């Protein structure tokens, strides 16, 4: 049917006129399908024959991808019409849905054709069925055309307004609206829940919106946007990881996609070594040979995907809880649940956001991602059970120069525990050898040397090939660590190298800094001090004259 | 009762900013607030043919919720036409006492130009995308749109002209929803003249719900440590800090001080300050008392604020337009109170600096904040009392700016 709803007024973009894309010539069998469809559609009021003075046109075609369907090419009109309040992009998340005793799924059939289109805008929808000779027939739309820029929003808003009466008289019946679907839930007796469905079905039929007849139709488990929804549990649809010898950029992309998708209910999914591959990427065609780390990751994912997992729905009376577990190379995993083994959902956090990081910083960032996620899904923030002790975190967030909001959390003792593997000293160390380090490299020949000069009288210079002033500045520190007792003072002129160490990293993209980290753990006390370069302080002046000079 | 035509800057479309997800608590408060605002006709529900959007937050400013609208983008896209549309007194920074009054409720009497109303559209988000938002637009002059004080100016001058004739030595500056009222009176007299004006405004239909003292502000000078026994490390720090300062005050000298370190020496070795090095350090303390030289304010250029966490509730800040040319510096302190946190203190500092900046120059600075972006966007509304919002971005504090500014 059609509708007595009010129409949304619609303008074209200021200074633009209607589309005039001529009709591609059509085979006479398709012109037969269009003429019959158009006369049926005309008979239902959805379209109208129009005079000759309408200047605008839009191409039309017929197909039946092995009944017939009419398809229209509004690409040109879409460019010329104004923008609309963007349709719902996000979708509800299964973990966010509140449990209900029964759920109906209604498909509004032919929904867009069931809604009127603004009158003054109708001239710009004109289309032509081709005559055999040239004189063709001219039709225009009176309902929302399928494929025009404004149909999804205007039908969405028309549907919201149509529901408003029925919803007010039924503060018991939950109606999610999503595209041209209605998902109806209630805690009524299945006898009367079917009554209220029947009411709603007709209320929409008065507004012109048809609904499934054969019972309420669509039956569980529900295949919905890559999910499986059961009456008591949800899970993702089954993932298939390809088995391949070579991989293109496009194949790895489709593979982190599926993997990312599975990580919301399959705890333990890892994707970082696989997306390290796409770091360069370039062309989706480029073949990217996999890595021993990428292979191990993909292997471990197939292992986890071998068993089936499910999540539960939301009860707003039960608490909201998250735990986070370490997974290794800066990869982390979390569950969010209300009942201790019934998980609402899971997820992963493996971002470095920089070349070097450390465990506490990464955990804090994981707690961030969970918080933003809980607000989007349940409108609240969870209680946190975390594998870290207050002393560990309190020390970290106090010495940390960046401001941070640590939630309330209880320690859960479940190793691997999050810890600071080392702390530099805040005061210089007494009776410890003072190493004055420096490095240099030639910005053209890229050759270099790192060296030190201590106060016990030791001096050393190690030669370096294919490096930069920044890399030698770290090798210099690395050299002083290698060559010192368990306690050492190091004095550097590098603001770069000071910055990287003082950050107290414990993992890194570069293997030099990974080497320096291993040194720093083995030491007992280390103090790192900075002096301005080329100011002849003493100590520094002699390493500059030794290494930087040559 | 008659509207004032409002234009966007030519060839410029309205805002399409994204609504931030809110907690169920904050949404329920926005819906209550917006239902009442709809009854009083200040806002109306809009259709899908309005594509514009401005974010909304719920803050507390009290135990009742307020609604704060982020017109930052709509202000870029129009208010500069209202910054030039048809003024800042430099004496307000000189007044001994300054009080801030919230007069933003006067705005809800003036109709808004019906052809501009689409640009004020905003959305109350739903949880988990169950619904699309509830969508409204403004009928009246909305708070936080810089065109609101611009249009109301004529009425507001009219209301204040009595009071200004009586008290001719009091400074009244308006910035957005606030009046800044400054006097040199005794504090008790000051609070009286504030009440006189408060009552004056309430008498003419201007519902009004902060005391500052710019005579105490300054540009904090650099302080060098004063020790009893110096180590090699203390002099290295002292020499490093004075080396930084010499990009700013030029007559600083370090020869005699670094002479004390000649040769390779252990860091813990105690060095005595020779008489020459003491004179150089004493002379260097004296040059740090005088201010910088060519640091002037350019009204056309942007003000930038940098902030450093210093430990134990201390936060330093600098306002400059060109690096090293510091217009103001200062340090903030929170009394902690075992209810404080890093984000409460950062949020409080941003507001102090912004108020201080508004008094001095009449515009908000663009902040470089030392915090992860995603952490700010979640928690900033929990201690935001101000009715305005400055521009901001996120940075990683360098390793030595902490101590040199300490
Ligand atoms: C089976 N299931 C989801 C429950 O039991 C939880 C209760 O969820 C609902 C509550 C009210 C209205 C509908 C509900 O279902 C849906 C909510 C959101 C999206 N949807 C897509 C489909 C399909 N196809 C069904 C739903
Ligand atoms: Mg050097």
UniProtKB/Swiss-Prot annotation, chain B:
Impact noted for substituting residue 181 to A: 37% increase of DNA-directed DNA polymerase activity. No loss of RNA-directed DNA polymerase activity
Mutagenesis or variant effect for residue 179 to R: 20% loss of DNA-directed DNA polymerase activity. 21% loss of RNA-directed DNA polymerase activity
Consequence of substituting residue 159 to V: 70% loss of DNA-directed DNA polymerase activity. 64% loss of RNA-directed DNA polymerase activity
Outcome of substituting residue 61 to A: Strong decrease in RT binding affinity for all dNTP substrates and in catalytic efficiency. 100-fold decreased sensitivity to ddNTP inhibitors
Consequence when changing residue 177 to N: Strongly decreased RNA-directed and DNA-directed DNA polymerase activities. No effect on RNase H activity
UniProt effect for mutating residue 277 to L: 68% loss of polymerase activity. 10% loss of RNase H activity
Effect in UniProt of substituting residue 288 to S: 31% loss of polymerase activity. No loss of RNase H activity
Effect of residue 148 to A: 74% loss of polymerase activity. 56% loss of RNase H activity
Consequence the record notes for mutating residue 380 to L: No effect on RT p66/p51 heterodimerization
The gene coding this protein: gag-pol
Outcome when changing residue 102 to S: 5- to 12-fold decrease in affinity for dTTP substrates. Strongly decreased RNA-directed DNA polymerase activity. Slightly decreased DNA-directed DNA polymerase activity. No effect on RNase H activity
Outcome (variant: residue 235 to T): 96% loss of polymerase activity. 45% loss of RNase H activity
Effect of residue 149 to G: 34% loss of polymerase activity. No loss of RNase H activity
Impact noted for substituting residue 392 to L: Almost complete loss of RT p66/p51 heterodimerization
Binding site for Mg(2+) 1: 102, 177-178
Annotated consequence of substituting residue 179 to V: 22% loss of DNA-directed DNA polymerase activity. No loss of RNA-directed DNA polymerase activity
Resulting phenotype, residue 213 to A: Complete loss of RNA-dependent DNA polymerase activity. Complete loss of RNA 5'-end and 3'-end cleavages
Domain of life per record: Viruses
Substitution effect: residue 379 to L: Almost complete loss of RT p66/p51 heterodimerization. Complete loss of polymerase activity
Annotated phenotype, changing residue 178 to N: Loss of pyrophosphorolysis (reverse of the polymerase reaction). No effect on RNase H activity
Impact after mutating residue 388 to L: No effect on RT p66/p51 heterodimerization
Protein name: p51 RT
Species of provenance: Human immunodeficiency virus type 1 group M subtype B (isolate BH10)
Outcome (variant: residue 159 to A): 71% loss of DNA-directed DNA polymerase activity. 61% loss of RNA-directed DNA polymerase activity
Domain Reverse transcriptase residue range list: 40-212
Site entry (Essential for RT p66/p51 heterodimerization), positions: 379, 392
């Amino acid at each position: 049917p059609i509708s007595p709803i009010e129409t949304v007024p619609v303008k074209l973009k200021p200074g633009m006129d209607g589309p005039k894309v001529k009709q591609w010539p059509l085979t006479e069998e398709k012109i037969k399908a269009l003429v019959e469809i158009c006369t049926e559609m005309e008979k239902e009021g959805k379209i109208s024959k129009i005079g000759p003075e309408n200047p605008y046109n839009t191409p039309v075609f017929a197909i039946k991808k092995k009944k017939w369907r009419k398809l229209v090419d509004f690409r040109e009109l879409n460019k010329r019409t104004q923008d609309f309040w963007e349709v719902q992009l996000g979708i509800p998340h299964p973990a966010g849905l509140k449990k209900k005793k029964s759920v109906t799924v209604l498909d509004v059939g032919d929904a867009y054709f069931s809604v009127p289109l603004d009158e003054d805008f109708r001239k710009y929808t004109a289309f032509t069925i081709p005559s055999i000779n040239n004189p063709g027939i001219r039709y225009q739309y009176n309902v929302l055309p399928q494929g025009w820029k404004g149909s999804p929003a205007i039908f969405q808003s028309s549907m919201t307004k149509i529901l408003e009466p029925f919803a007010a008289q039924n503060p018991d019946i939950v109606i999610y609206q999503y595209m041209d679907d209605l998902y109806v839930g209630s805690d009524l007796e299945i006898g009367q829940h079917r009554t209220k469905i029947e009411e709603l079905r007709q209320h929409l039929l008065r507004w012109g919106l048809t609904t499934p007849d054969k019972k309420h139709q669509k039956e569980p488990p529900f295949l919905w946007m890559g999910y499986e929804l059961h009456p008591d549990k949800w899970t993702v649809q089954p993932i298939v990881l390809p088995e391949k010898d070579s991989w293109t950029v496009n194949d790895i992309q489709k593979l982190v996609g599926k993997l990312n998708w599975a990580s919301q209910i399959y705890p333990g999914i890892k994707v970082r070594q696989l997306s390290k591959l796409l770091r360069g990427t370039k062309a989706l065609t480029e073949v990217i040979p996999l890595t021993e780390e990428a292979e191990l990751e993909l292997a471990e994912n197939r292992e986890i995907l071998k068993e089936p997992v499910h999540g539960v729905y939301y009860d707003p009376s039960k608490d909201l809880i998250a735990e986070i577990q370490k997974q290794g190379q800066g990869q982390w995993t979390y569950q969010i649940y209300q009942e201790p083994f019934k998980n609402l959902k899971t997820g992963k956090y493996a971002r470095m956001r920089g070349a070097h990081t450390n465990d506490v910083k990464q955990l804090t960032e994981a707690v961030q991602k969970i918080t933003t996620e809980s607000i989007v899904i349940w409108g609240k923030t969870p209680k946190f059970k975390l594998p870290i002790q207050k002393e560990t975190w309190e020390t970290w967030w106090t010495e940390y120069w960046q401001a941070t909001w640590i939630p309330e959390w209880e320690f859960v003792n479940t190793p691997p525990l999050v810890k600071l593997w080392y702390q530099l000293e805040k005061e210089p160390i007494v009776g410890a050898e003072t190493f004055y380090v420096d490095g240099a490299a030639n910005r053209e020949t890229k050759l270099g040397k790192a060296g030190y000069v201590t106060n016990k009288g030791r001096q050393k210079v190690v030669p370096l090939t294919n490096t930069t002033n920044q890399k030698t500045e770290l090798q210099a520190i690395y050299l002083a660590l290698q060559d010192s007792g368990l306690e050492v003072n190091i004095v550097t002129d590098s603001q770069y190298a000071l910055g990287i160490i003082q950050a107290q990293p414990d993992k890194s993209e570069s293997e030099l800094v990974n080497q320096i980290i291993e040194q720093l753990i083995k030491k007992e006390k280390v103090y790192l001090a900075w002096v301005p370069a080329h100011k002849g302080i003493g100590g520094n002046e002699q390493v500059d004259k030794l290494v930087s000079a040559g | 009762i008659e509207t004032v035509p409002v234009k966007l800057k030519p060839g410029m479309d309205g805002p399409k900013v994204k609504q931030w997800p809110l907690t169920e608590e904050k949404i329920k408060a926005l819906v209550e607030i917006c239902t009442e605002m709809e009854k009083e006709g200040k806002i109306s529900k809009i259709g899908p043919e309005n594509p514009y959007n401005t974010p909304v937050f719920a803050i507390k400013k009290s135990t009742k919720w307020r609604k704060l609208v982020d017109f930052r983008e709509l202000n870029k896209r129009t208010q500069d036409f209202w910054e030039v549309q048809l003024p800042h007194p430099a004496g307000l920074k000189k007044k001994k006492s300054v009080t801030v009054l919230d007069v933003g409720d006067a705005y809800f009497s003036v109709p808004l130009d019906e052809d501009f109303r689409k640009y004020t559209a905003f959305t109350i988000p739903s949880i988990n995308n169950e619904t699309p938002g509830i969508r409204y637009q403004y009928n009246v002059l909305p708070q936080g749109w810089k065109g609101s004080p611009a249009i109301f100016q004529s009425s507001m001058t009219k209301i204040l002209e009595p009071f200004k004739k009586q008290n001719p030595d009091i400074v009244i500056y308006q910035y957005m929803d606030d009046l800044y009222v400054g006097s040199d009176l005794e504090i008790g007299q000051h609070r009286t003249k504030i009440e006189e004006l408060r009552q004056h405004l309430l008498r003419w239909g201007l519902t009004t719900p902060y005391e500052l003292h710019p005579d105490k502000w300054t540009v904090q000078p650099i302080v060098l440590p004063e020790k009893d026994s110096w180590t090699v490390n203390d002099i290295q720090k002292l020499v490093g800090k004075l080396n930084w300062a010499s990009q700013i005050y030029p007559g600083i000298k370090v020869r005699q001080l670094s002479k004390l370190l000649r040769g390779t020496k252990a860091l813990t070795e105690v060095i005595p300050l020779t008489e020459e090095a003491e004179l150089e350090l004493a002379e260097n303390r004296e040059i740090l008392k005088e201010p910088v030289h060519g640091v002037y304010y350019d009204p056309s250029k942007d003000l930038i604020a940098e902030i450093q966490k210093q430990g134990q509730g201390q936060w330093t800040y600098q306002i400059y337009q060109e690096p090293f040319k510091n217009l103001k510096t200062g340090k903030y302190a929170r009394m902690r109170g075992a209810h404080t946190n890093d984000v409460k203190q950062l949020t409080e500092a941003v507001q102090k600096i912004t108020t201080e900046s508004i008094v001095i120059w009449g515009k908000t600075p663009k902040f470089k904040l030392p915090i992860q972006k995603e952490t700010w966007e979640t928690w900033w509304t929990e201690y935001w009392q101000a009715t305005w919002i400055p521009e901001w971005e996120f940075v990683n504090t360098p390793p030595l700016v902490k101590l040199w500014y300490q």
